[PDB]
Amino acid sequence: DEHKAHKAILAYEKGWLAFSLAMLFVFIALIAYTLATHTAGVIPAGKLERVDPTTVRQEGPWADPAQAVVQTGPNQYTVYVLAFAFGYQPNPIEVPQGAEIVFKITSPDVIHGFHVEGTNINVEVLPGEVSTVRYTFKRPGEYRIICNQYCGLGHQNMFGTIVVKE
Amino acid sequence: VYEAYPEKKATLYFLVLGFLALIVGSLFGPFQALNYGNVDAYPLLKRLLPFVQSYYQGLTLHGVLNAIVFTQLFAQAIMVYLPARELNMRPNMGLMWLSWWMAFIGLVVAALPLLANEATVLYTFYPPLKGHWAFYLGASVFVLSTWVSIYIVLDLWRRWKAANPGKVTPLVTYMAVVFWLMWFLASLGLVLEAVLFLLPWSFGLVEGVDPLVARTLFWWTGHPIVYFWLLPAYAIIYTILPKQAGGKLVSDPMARLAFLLFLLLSTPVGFHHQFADPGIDPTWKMIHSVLTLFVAVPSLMTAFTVAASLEFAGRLRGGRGLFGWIRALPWDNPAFVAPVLGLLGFIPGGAGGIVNASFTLDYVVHNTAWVPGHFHLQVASLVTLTAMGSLYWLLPNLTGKPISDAQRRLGLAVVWLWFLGMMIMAVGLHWAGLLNVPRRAYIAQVPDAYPHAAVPMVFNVLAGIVLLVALLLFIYGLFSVLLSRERKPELAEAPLPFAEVISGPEDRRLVLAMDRIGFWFAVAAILVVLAYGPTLVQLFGHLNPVPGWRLW
Amino acid sequence: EEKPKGALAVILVLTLTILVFWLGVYAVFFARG
Numbered sequence: 001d002e003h004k005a006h007k008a009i010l011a012y013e014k015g016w017l018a019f020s021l022a023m024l025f026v027f028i029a030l031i032a033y034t035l036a037t038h039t040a041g042v043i044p045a046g047k048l049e050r051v052d053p054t055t056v057r058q059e060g061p062w063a064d065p066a067q068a069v070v071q072t073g074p075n076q077y078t079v080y081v082l083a084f085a086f087g088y089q090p091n092p093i094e095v096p097q098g099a100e101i102v103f104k105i106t107s108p109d110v111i112h113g114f115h116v117e118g119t120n121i122n123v124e125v126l127p128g129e130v131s132t133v134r135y136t137f138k139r140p141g142e143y144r145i146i147c148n149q150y151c152g153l154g155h156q157n158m159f160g161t162i163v164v165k166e
Numbered sequence: 167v168y169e170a171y172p173e174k175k176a177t178l179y180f181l182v183l184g185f186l187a188l189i190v191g192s193l194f195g196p197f198q199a200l201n202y203g204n205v206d207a208y209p210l211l212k213r214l215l216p217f218v219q220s221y222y223q224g225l226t227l228h229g230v231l232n233a234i235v236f237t238q239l240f241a242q243a244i245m246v247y248l249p250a251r252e253l254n255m256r257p258n259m260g261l262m263w264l265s266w267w268m269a270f271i272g273l274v275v276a277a278l279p280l281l282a283n284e285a286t287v288l289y290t291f292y293p294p295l296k297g298h299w300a301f302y303l304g305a306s307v308f309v310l311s312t313w314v315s316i317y318i319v320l321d322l323w324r325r326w327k328a329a330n331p332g333k334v335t336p337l338v339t340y341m342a343v344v345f346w347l348m349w350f351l352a353s354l355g356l357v358l359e360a361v362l363f364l365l366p367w368s369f370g371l372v373e374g375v376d377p378l379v380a381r382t383l384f385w386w387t388g389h390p391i392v393y394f395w396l397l398p399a400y401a402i403i404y405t406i407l408p409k410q411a412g413g414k415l416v417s418d419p420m421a422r423l424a425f426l427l428f429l430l431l432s433t434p435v436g437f438h439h440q441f442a443d444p445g446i447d448p449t450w451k452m453i454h455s456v457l458t459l460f461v462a463v464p465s466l467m468t469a470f471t472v473a474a475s476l477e478f479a480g481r482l483r484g485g486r487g488l489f490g491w492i493r494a495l496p497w498d499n500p501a502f503v504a505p506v507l508g509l510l511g512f513i514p515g516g517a518g519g520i521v522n523a524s525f526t527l528d529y530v531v532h533n534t535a536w537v538p539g540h541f542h543l544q545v546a547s548l549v550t551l552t553a554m555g556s557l558y559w560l561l562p563n564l565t566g567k568p569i570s571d572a573q574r575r576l577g578l579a580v581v582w583l584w585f586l587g588m589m590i591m592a593v594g595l596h597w598a599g600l601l602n603v604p605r606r607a608y609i610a611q612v613p614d615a616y617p618h619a620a621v622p623m624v625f626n627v628l629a630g631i632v633l634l635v636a637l638l639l640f641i642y643g644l645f646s647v648l649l650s651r652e653r654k655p656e657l658a659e660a661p662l663p664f665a666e667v668i669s670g671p672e673d674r675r676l677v678l679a680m681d682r683i684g685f686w687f688a689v690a691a692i693l694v695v696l697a698y699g700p701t702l703v704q705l706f707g708h709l710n711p712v713p714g715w716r717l718w
Numbered sequence: 719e720e721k722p723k724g725a726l727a728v729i730l731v732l733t734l735t736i737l738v739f740w741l742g743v744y745a746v747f748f749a750r751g
């Protein structure tokens with residue numbers, strides 16, 4: 001008693017640790033798995049891509065809303081999105097489904113969230129940096145974009161729309 | 167009581183200041199819970215509190231007061247006082263009162279801008295959102311207060327090592343030491359952010375700040391800071407709870423190992439808060455993901471060590487079968503209850519965290535109402551409750567004021583309510599999160615935005631009312647305890663209810679290794695440079711400062 | 719006395735919850751893929 005409870009307690013403790021490390025390594029494996037699949041596109045690009053947030057909507061690929069989408073491969077379209085204080089340009093965003101859309105998103109003011117409801121596109125958008133994410137839409141219809149990073153009084157009302165043509 | 171234990175006073179002043187903060191912050195809680203239940207209660211609050219300007223001014227105040235002011239002041243209380251009484255040594259009093267004044271001067275200075283709607287930027291304060299200088303200077307001085315606290319404890323520890331040459335650091339002190347060292351390393355992120363960017367910016371020395379480096383440096387501190395909130399509660403759970411339960415801490419070495427591992431892995435994991443950030447390598451994120459998974463381990467041990475100790479306790483109290491030991495615990499004692507329930511909610515809390523920390527899985531819930539669901543089970547539940555229950559032994563010990571049967575049952579209501587509410591809220595927030603409902607959002611001002619969350623919006627309403635009532639009862643009781651002129655001096659000079667430790671033969675060699683703190687602190691410091699070094703070097707090379715904005 | 723059946727009980731609940739959560743969201747991740 002007490003001392004007999006010590007050893008047993010310490011024994012099952014070692015077993016518990018062995019098991020807990022093993023379960024965590026299983027998790028580590030299943031994540032690595034997704035890192036090898038298509039679904040891994042949603043991870044923002046690692047390389048820094050610096051822009052001017054004060055000159056963003058006056059020159060360059062974000063200046064004209066009409067030029068926002070660009071066919072850049074046989075089934076690849078790059079969309080230049082701009083999330084700004086309380087909205088998203090272009091609105092709505094139009095893209096074909098079964099095509100790989102490569103978003104390149106920035107802001108001219110402060111930090112925004114870009115969260116496409118129903119997908120894995122959830123990225124932070126930084127003033128003076130480009131958030132590059134890759135995704136394929138498999139279902140067509142109107143996907144709603146939400147700002148999920150506090151950006152000011154009008155943050156709760158900052159919504160956008162992605163249009164993926166069947 | 168104060169002249170030979172003057173540490174007793176200073177410790178009370180931290181705790182009082184800390185419980186005021188907690189109250190003022192918590193007021194906004196109910197309203198936010200209602201807001202997430204699609205009910206707009208703010209014109210009512212704005213009537214009551216005419217200074218409040220926005221939902222977001224409220225949210226700033228709720229974060230800062232609770233998760234920053236309350237939690238720090240409670241750690242500065244426990245993680246100085248508990249070692250002091252174990253060692254039976256006096257902390258450098260000159261230094262102790264200096265740290266209190268800093269925390270108080272700092273709190274007032276920052277408050278003035280917060281209350282003046284001059285820095286509605288939330289507790290994260292992400293640039294380019296530009297707050298009033300006195301917010302940043304106030305925060306600084308508030309957080310540097312802990313650098314005095316580090317010193318204080320190291321001083322105590324050195325001095326004890328001198329009078330006991332070659333003896334192993336006692337348990338609590340060991341916890342306190344690795345604690346304050348870990349915080350020291352961890353604080354370096356935020357201090358740099360402040361010193362290099364946020365201070366000169368707010369003062370107007372510069373006109374821009376890079377958001378990417380700013381939030382990187384932020385999170386270097388950002389993650390460990392939550393451990394900084396957790397460990398003072400862990401210290402109480404490991405060394406006082408088992409005595410409140412009627413048993414013993416079943417392993418000294420385990421507790422040491424848990425804490426050591428926190429020292430090691432607390433800081434080098436910040437990228438799990440930046441999974442959705444650009445300009446950071448996906449490999450570095452996978453790495454920080456794995457180390458994050460590892461930082462789970464310490465709490466996994468904690469869970470067994472602690473559940474054993476309470477089973478054992480339950481057993482001595484005449485425990486029954488598989489579940490008998492549960493019923494034989496002192497459920498009439500709020501000091502036992504509060505932290506046990508906290509631990510219950512911590513199970514769903516942890517599972518939440520591990521999910522968040524799985525890299526690619528973060529995209530499902532990042533910035534959604536799930537995240538606030540996660541952390542109210544951690545900080546607002548486990549930490550706060552252990553903090554609340556602990557008044558039942560700590561307040562008397564400090565003041566000599568007893569606790570009547572009424573106040574004991576009052577507490578019991580408060581404790582159960584707070585726990586039920588939080589649980590109810592947790593179901594709400596997680597559910598809403600999976601349903602893509604964002605956080606930091608005044609969503610009751612756009613009622614038609616999220617119809618798909620009909621039913622978990624009910625829970626959020628329900629929590630808000632339950633937790634309102636619990637809050638008012640807390641204030642009523644807490645003040646009933648501090649405002650009574652009942653005093654027994656002899657219970658003020660009653661030793662803390664530290665728990666006995668069970669110890670075996672194998673301990674010696676393992677504990678000995680763990681008492682090589684200087685070596686472990688250098689190991690920990692290296693891990694920090696290995697994880698953050700390569701990336702910080704890369705951002706600092708390519709600084710792209712953008713100008714400030716005020717959007718409130 | 720003996721085996722910490724109670725503690726083992728607790729860590730089982732903990733483990734199971736973790737799996738509910740982890741596997742649950744791992745599904746939702748692919749569902750939104």
Ligand code: HAS
Nearest residue numbers: 392438465469473509512516519520522523532541544545
């Ligand atoms: C004080 C509160 C804090 C704790 C503690 C905490 C725990 C974890 N978290 Fe977290 N967290 C994340 C990962 C983790 C992980 C892996 C853990 C782990 O430490 C959890 C370990 C816990 C366990 C492994 C469970 C142990 C269970 C125990 C010990 C209880 C057993 C009960 C017993 C024995 C009682 C039985 C008794 C009887 C009588 C039967 C991640 C991702 O990796 C995010 C990013 C989300 C995003 O995208 O923004 C995150 C988000 C947050 C935020 C949002 C920050 C913001 O505003 O931006 C806060 C404030 C926070 C606080 C805390 N968090 N966390």
Ligand code: HEM
Nearest residue numbers: 192195196198199229232233288289538546605606607633
């Ligand atoms: C009275 C009980 C409480 C209630 C009803 C409550 C409710 C809430 C709700 C619904 C949110 C989400 C607000 C949003 O995302 O816009 C929130 C945010 C938050 N709560 Fe609480 N809470 C309570 C207590 C606490 C406590 C005790 C703490 C810490 C000690 C705490 C820390 C936080 C933090 C850090 C945030 C995040 C603010 C931010 O995102 O910047 N809460 N609270």
Ligand code: CUA
Nearest residue numbers: 112147151155
């Ligand atoms: Cu943009 Cu919130």
Ligand SMILES: [Cu+]
Nearest residue numbers: 388389438439
């Ligand atoms: Cu974290």
